[PDB]
Amino acid sequence: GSGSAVDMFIKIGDVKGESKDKTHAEEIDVLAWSWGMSQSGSMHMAGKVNVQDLSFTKYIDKSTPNLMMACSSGKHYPQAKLTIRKAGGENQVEYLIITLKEVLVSSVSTGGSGGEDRLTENVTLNFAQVQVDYQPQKADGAKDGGPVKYGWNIR
Amino acid sequence: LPLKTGEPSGFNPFQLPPTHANLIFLKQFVKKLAEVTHRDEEEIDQAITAMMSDSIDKSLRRLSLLLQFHARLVKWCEGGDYGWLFDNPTDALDLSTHQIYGFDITEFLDNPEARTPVMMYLLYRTESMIDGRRFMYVFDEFWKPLQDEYFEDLAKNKQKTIRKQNGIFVFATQEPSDALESNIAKTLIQQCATYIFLANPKADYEDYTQGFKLTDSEFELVRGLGEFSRRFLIKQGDQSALAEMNLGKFRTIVDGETVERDFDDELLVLSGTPDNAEIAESIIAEVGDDPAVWLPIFLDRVKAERSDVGSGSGSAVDMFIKIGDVKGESKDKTHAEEIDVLAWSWGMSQSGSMHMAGKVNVQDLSFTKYIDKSTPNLMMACSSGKHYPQAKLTIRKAGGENQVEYLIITLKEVLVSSVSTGGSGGEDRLTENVTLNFAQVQVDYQPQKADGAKDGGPVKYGWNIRQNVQA
């Protein structure tokens, strides 16, 4: 077989990676994802939520000073798109698709002081509207589909 | 005694035995210049003996003046030949503890000046000093230092003297055009007892049956031997056969074990050039004369490095600097030996949104180095707020140590504002930090691929940070 590895690729505008995998042909590839949702208006003391900005750790893309010019200029990319499949096979069911709109870069990491010898870069972003498509991520290869969604706004 | 800098890569003469300094300086001068008035050169030898009779071995100016009243001119030059016969001691007899040495003939390619008088005097020294043990004198490309019948008369008289005194001569030279072109080599072949056809290289043939008197089958074998198996053919007396050194032989302890091919201590014989350079540099900086008291651990280090990699030198990291007076400890082409830095970690952030011309994020930029050498210049630039004219730093991942750097970043008008220093009982190597601002970033991020490909051209972020959004 091919092993046991998750399958995650993303495009955000003309930002692209140096990845060489089977489904990651110079795609952006990530090592960590970090965003959760929160709604402080709950009775335990419409869309009134606490602010939640998105974040991740990615492998090194070929367009990083373009991202820094986007940060210092306020330039957003109009769309970010993700596909994440569970481990067990690279060409399995696309267990998750994510679509992000008005994708402005919030932060970059990893270059400067001596804290990270070879570590991947955290990048944080903001948004206007995000929607996902979840296929059932059972610990399997070929598994039943049917996307369950949410699409949600910055409001 | 290999080719090196202008240290003693040769051996000199005593130059003042007043019964034989005349003949020593006469032969040394004629083999140094090879062209005189041919009148009262013994008076020149006696006058330079009386002039060097102050204590010993005076300046080249005094030597050339006493010799005159092109050899004087080239001794005044001394280009790469500090081991000549004048103003020096005999480094060969400073090896009287272990009289085992040899010469890189790269300087002794230049007859008559560097080649002839040092070699003729040292052959005189080793031949006249009959220590009673065996003697061995080995040659390769004999004809370039030896262009005079002086060596033929030497081989007739003093070589036959030391032939009863355990002396042997090992002429392992090149292709036989060299030997057939010198009648001195013909006289030597008339006294050379055995002949080793070590290889069949690119070499001139079919006069090789002349003088040596090979048969057709013998000449067929010495041409069909080859040079890569490193086996040979041997003729002595009037007879010959194919032979070898058993380079495939190995320690057959029980039933035929691991084929070590006797490769341990063969690196002395093989002499691989970067490992020879490492062992030679560590020995030469270690001790002047070279007994094998530090050599076994150097052989174990050479075996470990050769089993690791052949001249790899890591090729994994590159993080180096030059900020005013400091510089890098760089294995890359940029700097050398001074200061390494730790790693690559900083960024910038933005909290705002335009999607329901950036935001002002008051930030500093920082960097961590190791223990410094140029402490007070950085101290002055830190306290006074002095902007260095540049701060250049080199970043490159694995994929080669001499490749183009993955990010070359020069910050501009680097005022210095804080440096963390430290120290402890456990501070084997203190790291320190500069956290600072400046006028301009000049980031040059090259999107170099993993295989050494640099598609495409590097992306620059060369913008003012001081009071301006950076494009």
Author numbering:
A (entry chain E): 826 to 870, 876 to 985
B (entry chain D): 496 to 529, 534 to 568, 584 to 870, 876 to 990
Provide the authors' original text about this structure.
In Gram-negative bacteria, conjugation is mediated by a large transport apparatus—the conjugative type IV secretion system (T4SS)—produced by the donor cell and embedded in both its outer and inner membranes. The T4SS also elaborates a long extracellular filament—the conjugative pilus—that is essential for DNA transfer. Here we present a single-particle cryo-EM structure of a T4SS complex from the R388 plasmid that comprises all four sub-complexes: OMCC, stalk, arches and IMC. Three ATPases, VirB4 (also known as TrwK), VirB11 (also known as TrwD) and VirD4, power the system.
We first solved the structure of VirB4 in its unbound form (VirB4unbound) and fitted and rebuilt the structure within the IMC density. NSEM provides a view of a double-barrelled IMC made of two side-by-side trimers of dimers (the barrels) of the AAA+ VirB4 ATPase, whereas cryo-ET shows a central hexamer of dimers of the same protein. Of note, a minority of the 2D classes in our cryo-EM data set displayed the typical side-views of the double-barrelled architecture observed in the NSEM structure, indicating the presence of a small number of double-barrelled particles.
